[PDB]
Design an enzyme around this catalytic site. Structure first.
Site, PDB file in Angstrom:
ATOM      1  N   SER A 182       0.506  -1.432   0.289  1.00  0.00           N
ATOM      2  CA  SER A 182      -0.315   0.263  -0.118  1.00  0.00           C
ATOM      3  C   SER A 182       0.690   1.219   0.039  1.00  0.00           C
ATOM      4  O   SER A 182       1.737   1.131   0.775  1.00  0.00           O
ATOM      5  CB  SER A 182      -1.024   0.204   1.186  1.00  0.00           C
ATOM      6  OG  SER A 182      -2.043   0.852   1.324  1.00  0.00           O
ATOM      7  N   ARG A 183       1.154   2.320  -1.235  1.00  0.00           N
ATOM      8  CA  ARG A 183       1.469   3.537  -1.005  1.00  0.00           C
ATOM      9  C   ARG A 183       1.184   3.936  -0.201  1.00  0.00           C
ATOM     10  O   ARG A 183       2.451   4.863  -0.053  1.00  0.00           O
ATOM     11  CB  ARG A 183       1.262   3.262  -2.815  1.00  0.00           C
ATOM     12  CG  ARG A 183       3.437   3.253  -3.350  1.00  0.00           C
ATOM     13  CD  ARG A 183       2.867   3.270  -5.263  1.00  0.00           C
ATOM     14  NE  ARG A 183       3.976   2.735  -5.633  1.00  0.00           N
ATOM     15  CZ  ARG A 183       5.112   3.336  -6.035  1.00  0.00           C
ATOM     16  NH1 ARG A 183       5.608   5.010  -5.032  1.00  0.00           N
ATOM     17  NH2 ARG A 183       6.378   2.739  -6.704  1.00  0.00           N
ATOM     18  N   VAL A 184       0.278   4.414   0.360  1.00  0.00           N
ATOM     19  CA  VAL A 184      -0.496   5.125   1.474  1.00  0.00           C
ATOM     20  C   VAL A 184       0.166   4.782   2.149  1.00  0.00           C
ATOM     21  O   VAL A 184       1.340   5.484   3.191  1.00  0.00           O
ATOM     22  CB  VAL A 184      -1.918   5.806   1.078  1.00  0.00           C
ATOM     23  CG1 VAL A 184      -2.031   6.176   2.348  1.00  0.00           C
ATOM     24  CG2 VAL A 184      -2.060   5.891   0.364  1.00  0.00           C
TER      25      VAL A 184
END
Ligand SMILES: Nc1ncnc2c1ncn2[C@@H]1O[C@H](COP(=O)(O)OP(=O)(O)OP(=O)(O)O)[C@@H](O)[C@H]1O
Ligand SMILES: Nc1ncnc2c1ncn2[C@@H]1O[C@H](COP(=O)(O)OP(=O)(O)O)[C@@H](O)[C@H]1O
Ligand SMILES: [Mg+2]
Ligand SMILES: [Mg+2]
Lengths: 365, 177, 351, 277, 210, 70, 52, 52, 105, 52
Positions: free
Chosen positions: F6-8
């Site tokens: 998850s790039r967040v």
């Protein structure tokens, strides 16, 4: 009828026919021009008829070398003695446009077909790179407005190659022994020009890159080079049985190499270690020095007669030479010369130094 | 009298002529030992090197001032420059003395070599110390081991070893402090 | 292992120089060996369609079929390599129409289309020059219908139509053993059986190089010899065990003396299934040779000479038992005990 | 043609993970075996300083034991001591001595039969299956004393460090048959010792050489088990190296085939669309 | 026609006859491979055109051996029997010793078993590999290559381990009398009167690894 | 768990779930490094056995039961 | 591969799926038996890499 | 459920091959014990001296 | 990327500075020029890319140099498509890169 | 697989040198001081070469 070449791997595992079509399949640097030049040197003088060399899309340096070494062999005689020449050269080399390379094989066939039909005698037709015929037709074929076939080729590949190759045959009146070098494009034998050429040949000699990277020259793949003469009703039961025994040993080695590479040789059974030892021995023993490679290797080249290579490979198969090392078989002619190379290798095994003085490197003598 | 002049330095000079030259000479258990027997010294005074061994243990390899060993004739004590001895040991207690403290090792039998250079090599199979012995199984062990005697000679030997071991163990567990 | 009934299409698929036409040649030579001993009705008339080969190759085959005598029952349709692409694309249909005369008149045909892979390359040439747009690898879309139209003509007709049959043997060449090619996966899904021949089995001495694991026959054992329906059911079962214990013993780990007996007998059967080139065996000297191998009668014979052992089993056992086996079609217990009674009075090599 | 290379990548990758697991478990079993080996080396020293070390004796009967392994992924251990076994059987033999050849471990009967098929007489195996104890070595020595030789030869690999295993020949002489005869040098070297046993010195030497054979055998198959573990630790490390080499070459080959697949499958689409446009 | 593209270009690199002037043109086509794959299309196209190859391996380059010549794979047979005779004398045993070094390095995938007969050629080969590598933008005349390889395949270099052979080769070039380079250049080959003074002048140089 | 990302990332997680997932994903990462080595069970390793047992403790926790969201 | 092992019908026990394999449709006794059978077969599928 | 729990761990694995029910597995296991205990009968009958 | 290169080229040419350029994901530049060439009707080259891959890359990367006024330096993020360094987009991109900075976890 | 104190006395010197080299490769950044607290240190080239 058999054509003895003096090459051990050819005369043993894929023997050539005297009026057969012979293909040397190669992958850009594996040695099919050296092999076809050795076939010229070995076969073309013992054969009494005429010879035609058709150079289709190859180096012009190689054509000049072949011309100048056919002059100083007396096969080509210049001047007023021209009628006593044994070879005619047709050349459509790789600096020519694609129309000249797509038709010069047919000029070579016409010169050979006149000798076969009208003169009625036996011809040798050496075609260096019959692939360049197909490649030149596929170069001009995109501009003829055709939908291209597989990988990039002309749709008419198989019939063009068939119409060319069905003329290089022996007839009731004459005979053409045809040796053709066949380039394979990216070491891919499933490319449609090698894969189409394979059907037209009585004896395919498939040359490998991984064999040549083991130093084994000629780099003939012994489990991919076939012939229609490996038949016990043709070459005798002893020759057929030693060829099939050599092939079974090499196939069992190839089956073992995946676990040899990972687990080492220490995990083998003892009959498997015998298989690996005899297979490395016959792998080195199919290697042979050539009389046309003696100019760049230093080793003089050995012609090996058919009975000698049959008896030698039969002896390695039965077990008579299990005492000799691996590298005594490498680049030797007979089964005598592995014994003399073990005699030469063994004697040195002590001779390493004690050359201190009493030299020729003095300062007054 | 010594008609086979054996030894490692003879095996390494004869082995070079009967073996392939690729194999190096095999090692020998003399090359992995350091303290010999006939060699000079190795005592220096009131202490002496005592190698108390076991197949599965090395209980002591220090120096002691006296070693009481449970020989088959009876308990003897090894002092510093003792006579060379190959004493077979009865089931009993070895005590390694190093001053005022005494470790009471009950062995189950074995041997004890005092070498000419003063090195004591006690060599037993099992050597339990006396605190990890229970006094409960030894008494029913002697009572049961003084009961079952068939016509087998093998069980007579095993039962005699049983009664002498458990009886020496009760003698050395009821007579402690 | 891969039995073939009259009216079945059986594909002979394999890599480049394996025993593909050799199986096809032996099936034609053997029909001449059977047509001389059966009545007029159950004789098989062969057709060999030679698409895209050399004229030299087919001249060696008419020389072979005249020498054995198999040319008396054999048509030889040959569109060779120099022929026009619509002659190679049409020659299997021309040959199948010749073979269908025997199917439509109560007799029995056998057609062999050597290289249907070369019939598709000639069809791709005509299609790409008639500007029909290319598909997979360059082939037309209609190339499944090129071969399914042809191979569905090999049938076994009803008795209202004569009861004739046509048995097809299409031959397909693969490239690196890659049976996932486009034309190879078309014919595998058309034909009933499959005879996959491998090059690494070919060089291990196993000739015919028949991959036992991949070779199917969708007619099953319902269309084979009842004398070999009972002795070769265990042969395909014992060889299934031998394939598994030889993959593990390739490492060199352990043997169990009950796993090794599987590896012992399976190596007897793979030497038993070997056959030389131009000599087919009738049906009953086959199942006797499988009786000698699946009953233990060739144990205590060395693995190197079971090929040499079974000439002795056919020579020394008297020819009276092959006539009872052929005429009954089945090893009766009056024959089964009397067979193994004579399978001890034989001089095997080594012993 | 691109699912055979993918499943070969999967095969070589799980072979490499299996082999790294085997390497780490041999490295763990080498450390737990080094607890037992260095303790058992002590009891060998009193018998080798009391009886000496006499490998080349002129015995007329010997019992030779090659201490081999059970599991076979050692990497040239059992072959090395089979070479050493025949290179001592060709050395200590002098006059026509009866040699009984014994193997401890399954990998000895696989190769001593290949060397000495007729003199091979006994096969002890499954010994490292649970652990090695002194009662086990004592029973094996009892079975060797069922034969009555003048000498014993034990061929084992001395575990020195985690990389060094030297093959070792450890000799035990029969008590008064040859051992007392090899100790007398104009008198004796054994008559310095005051014997404190019940019965005679022949009986105490008969007990002492049985105990020396049991100790030598126990230490021999502890040393060979520790060298077995430390040699599997290096054989399964070179095999992970070669299974990483084969995997890297297969991944380069697979990416070449993947690129070529996308190119030819795109060229087919362009060739089909250019025939219609 | 990407084969013809390169073939018609490289075929113009000829050695002309005597009646055309005797002129020549040497070509050095450069082909970059991807991840060492020499069985690519354009690579194998040009291997079928040229007279030889000079393979430059990235593994030899990353190990500091520069020029990273793959000695086993690189070939020039047309230039053979057309080279310096003084270098042709020394390079034959150089080639055989490097062949033996490659095969006794392939023999040792592992450091655990030493042979002390292959260890000689395994140190002579690491001597010759360190001898062969040179630094950039300083090409060496052919006589100073011949003398250095003469000092490497013979004795005169066995005392330096593997490390100082560059410094030893520079000391060989600087400390040997510069007349012997002139004799080797003008005579072309090594005469007996020349390798006499070669064995003489090479023993009186001082090698820095001692 | 190794390929999911998850790039967040950690900026948009439940705090408190943020306090346990930081060691949960590390412990699962170590278990994935020692994964496929738990076929050697009696062939113990005594330090990788703890992370193997804890990784098996954690992967059987994350399983769920089909339209029962928590 | 299941056909070449002699097992017929050669149904891949793992690769075969149904929408009826829910516990609230066929019950829990059928569902837990099916999931346990597939779990044991996937365990043996992982173990066959290390047995062979 | 039985072969998954361990109720039938005492039967041979070829007793499960090509049989319908677990009743068929129990009838096949003891039929195999029965046939392999009947393999020693071809030792002295119908080699010779047969009753026509 | 040409717009960012023009903004850097003013500072290089007119201001005479040492400019940094950050072409974030040069692979996405390659991807977008591939899509533009595909929409314009051009026949794609190797693996799937534009026939003008080397030329559309060299049109960008040759304006990032040192002039006699100043220089532009590029720190271009590089994506490797199938973790394949022989793919034509990273193989063509690496022919221009004078340095690589690998950030690792 | 062997232990951190299994190593030779020279390889432990290389471990203690490389472990303090790879510490020294880290650096506090001037832009990161609004959320890390520690100020950022620009390092010149000669200082880098001399310190390393
Ligand atoms: N059963 C066999 N025993 C021994 N040799 C065989 C056997 N079958 C085939 N061969 C040999 O193998 C070679 C190939 O056989 P065949 O002619 O069947 O090949 P093919 O599959 O038709 O190959 P191609 O399609 O290239 O002609 C032949 O030379 C033949 O002599
Ligand atoms: N029989 C051989 N012996 C030694 N070297 C060989 C042999 N065949 C080939 N070679 C090597 O391979 C190179 C290529 O040979 P050539 O026949 O020109 O290859 P091709 O025609 O396949 O491109 C030669 O320069 C030579 O170095
Ligand atoms: Mg050529
Ligand atoms: Mg054929």
């Amino acid at each position: 009828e058999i054509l003895v070449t003096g090459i051990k791997v050819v005369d043993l595992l894929a023997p050539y026919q005297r009026g057969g079509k012979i293909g040397l399949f190669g992958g850009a640097g594996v040695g099919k021009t050296v092999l076809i030049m050795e076939l010229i040197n070995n076969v073309a003088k013992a054969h009494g008829g005429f010879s035609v060399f058709a150079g289709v899309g190859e180096r012009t340096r190689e054509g000049n070398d072949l011309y100048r070494e056919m002059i100083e062999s007396g096969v080509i005689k210049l001047g007023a003695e021209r009628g006593n020449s044994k070879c005619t050269l047709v050349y459509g080399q790789m600096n020519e446009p694609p129309g000249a390379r797509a038709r010069v094989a047919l000029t070579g066939l016409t010169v050979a077909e006149y000798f076969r039909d009208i003169e009625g005698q036996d011809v040798l037709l050496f075609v260096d790179n019959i692939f360049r015929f197909t490649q030149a037709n596929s170069e001009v074929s995109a501009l003829l407005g055709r939908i291209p076939s597989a990988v990039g080729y002309q749709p008419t590949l198989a019939t063009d190659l068939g119409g060319l190759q069905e003329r290089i045959t022996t007839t009731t009146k004459g005979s053409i022994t045809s040796v053709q070098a066949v380039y394979v494009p990216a070491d891919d034998l499933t490319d449609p020009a090698p894969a189409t050429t394979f059907a037209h040949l009585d004896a395919t000699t498939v040359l490998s890159r991984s064999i040549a990277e083991l130093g084994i020259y000629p780099a003939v793949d012994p489990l991919d080079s076939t012939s229609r003469m490996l038949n016990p009703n043709v070459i005798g039961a002893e020759h057929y049985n030693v060829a099939r025994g050599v092939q079974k040993v090499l196939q069992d080695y190839k089956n073992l190499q995946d676990i040899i590479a990972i687990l080492g040789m220490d995990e083998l059974s003892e009959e498997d270690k015998l298989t690996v030892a005899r297979a490395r021995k016959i792998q080195r023993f199919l290697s042979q020095p050539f009389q046309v490679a003696e100019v760049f290797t230093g080793t003089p080249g050995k012609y090996v007669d058919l009975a000698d290579t049959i008896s030698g490979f039969q002896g390695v198969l039965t077990g008579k030479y299990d005492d000799l090392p691996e590298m005594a078989f490498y680049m030797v002619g007979d089964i005598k010369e592995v014994k003399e190379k073990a005699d030469k290798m063994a004697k040195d095994i002590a001779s390493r130094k004690e050359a201190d003085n009493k030299k020729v490197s003095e300062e007054l003598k | 009298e010594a008609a086979a002049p054996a030894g490692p330095k003879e095996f390494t000079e004869v082995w070079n002529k009967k073996a392939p030259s690729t194999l190096i000479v095999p090692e020998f258990p003399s090359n992995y030992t350091a303290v010999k027997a006939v060699g000079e010294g190795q005592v220096h005074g009131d202490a002496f090197p005592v190698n108390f061994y076991t197949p599965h243990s090395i209980l002591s390899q220090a120096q002691k001032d006296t070693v009481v060993l449970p020989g088959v004739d009876g308990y003897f004590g090894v002092k510093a420059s003792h006579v060379p001895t190959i004493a077979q040991l009865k089931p009993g207690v070895v005590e390694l003395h190093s001053g005022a403290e005494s470790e009471k090792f009950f062995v189950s039998g074995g041997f004890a070599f005092v070498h000419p250079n003063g090195v004591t090599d006690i060599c037993v199979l099992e050597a339990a110390t006396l605190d990890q012995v229970d006094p409960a199984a030894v008494k029913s062990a002697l009572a049961a081991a003084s009961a079952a005697q068939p016509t087998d000679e093998f069980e007579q030997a095993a039962n005699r070893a049983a009664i002498e071991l458990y009886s020496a163990l009760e003698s050395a567990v009821e007579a402690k402090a | 292992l891969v039995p073939i009934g009259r009216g079945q299409r059986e594909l002979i698929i394999g890599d480049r120089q394996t025993g593909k036409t050799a199986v096809a040649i032996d099936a034609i030579i053997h029909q001449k060996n059977c047509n001389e001993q059966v009545p007029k009705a159950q004789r098989v008339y062969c057709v060999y369609v030679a698409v895209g080969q050399k004229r030299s190759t087919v001249a060696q085959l008419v020389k072979l079929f005249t020498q054995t005598g198999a040319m008396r029952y054999t048509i030889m349709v040959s569109a060779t390599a120099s022929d026009a692409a619509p002659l190679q694309f049409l020659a299997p249909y021309s040959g199948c129409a010749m073979a269908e005369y025997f199917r439509d008149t109560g007799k029995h045909g056998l057609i062999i289309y050597d290289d249907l892979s070369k019939q598709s390359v000639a069809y791709r040439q005509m299609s790409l020059l008639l500007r029909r747009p290319p598909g997979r690898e360059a082939f037309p879309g209609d190339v499944f219908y090129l071969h399914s139209r042809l191979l569905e003509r090999a049938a076994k007709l009803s008795k209202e139509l004569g009861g004739g049959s046509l048995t097809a043997f299409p031959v397909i060449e693969t490239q690196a053993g890659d049976v996932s090619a486009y034309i190879a996966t078309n014919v595998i899904s058309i034909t009933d059986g499959q005879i996959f021949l491998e090059t690494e089995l070919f060089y291990k001495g196993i000739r015919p190089a028949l991959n036992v694991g991949l070779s199917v026959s969708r007619v099953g054992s319902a269309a084979q010899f009842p004398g070999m329906k009972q002795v070769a059911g265990t042969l395909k079962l014992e060889l299934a065990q031998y394939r598994e214990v030889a993959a593990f013993a390739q490492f060199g780990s352990d043997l169990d003396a009950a796993t090794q007996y599987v590896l012992e007998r399976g190596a007897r059967l793979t030497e038993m299934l070997k056959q030389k080139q131009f000599a087919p065996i009738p049906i009953e000297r086959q199942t006797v040779a499988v009786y000698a191998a699946t009953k233990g009668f060739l144990d205590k014979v060395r693995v190197q000479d079971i090929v040499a052992a079974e000439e002795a089993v056919i020579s020394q056992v008297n020819p009276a038992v092959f006539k009872i086996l052929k005429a009954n079609g089945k090893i009766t217990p009056a024959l089964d005990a009397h067979l193994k009674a004579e399978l001890r009075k034989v001089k095997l090599p080594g012993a | 043609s691109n699912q055979a290379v993918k499943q070969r990548i999967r095969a070589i990758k799980n072979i490499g993970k299996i082999t790294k697991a085997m390497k780490m478990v041999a490295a763990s079993k080498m450390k737990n075996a080094q607890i037992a080996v260095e303790q058992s080396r002590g009891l060998v020293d009193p018998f080798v300083r009391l009886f000496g070390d006499f490998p080349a004796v002129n015995s007329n009967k010997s019992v030779v034991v090659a201490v081999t392994s059970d599991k076979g992924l050692c990497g040239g251990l059992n072959s090395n001591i089979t070479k050493y076994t025949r290179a001592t059987l060709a050395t200590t033999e002098s006059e026509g001595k009866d040699v009984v050849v014994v193997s401890i471990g399954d990998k000895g009967r696989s190769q001593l039969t290949r060397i000495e098929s007729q003199r091979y007489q006994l096969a002890i195996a499954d010994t490292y299956k649970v652990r090695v104890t002194f009662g086990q070595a004592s029973l094996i020595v009892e079975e060797l004393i069922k034969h009555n030789p003048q000498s014993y030869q034990i061929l084992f690999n001395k575990f020195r460090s985690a990389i060094s295993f030297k093959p070792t020949v450890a000799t035990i002489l029969s008590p008064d048959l040859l051992e007392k005869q090899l100790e007398d040098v104009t008198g004796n070297s054994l008559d310095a010792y005051d014997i404190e046993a019940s019965h005679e010195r022949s009986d105490v030497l008969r007990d002492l050489t049985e105990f020396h054979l049991g100790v030598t055998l126990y230490n021999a198959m502890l040393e060979n088990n520790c060298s077995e573990h430390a040699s599997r630790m290096s054989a399964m490390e070179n095999s992970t190296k070669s299974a990483g080499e084969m995997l890297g070459k297969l991944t380069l080959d697979y990416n070449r085939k993947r690129q070529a697949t996308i190119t030819t499958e795109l060229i087919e689409i362009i060739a089909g669309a250019s025939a219609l446009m």
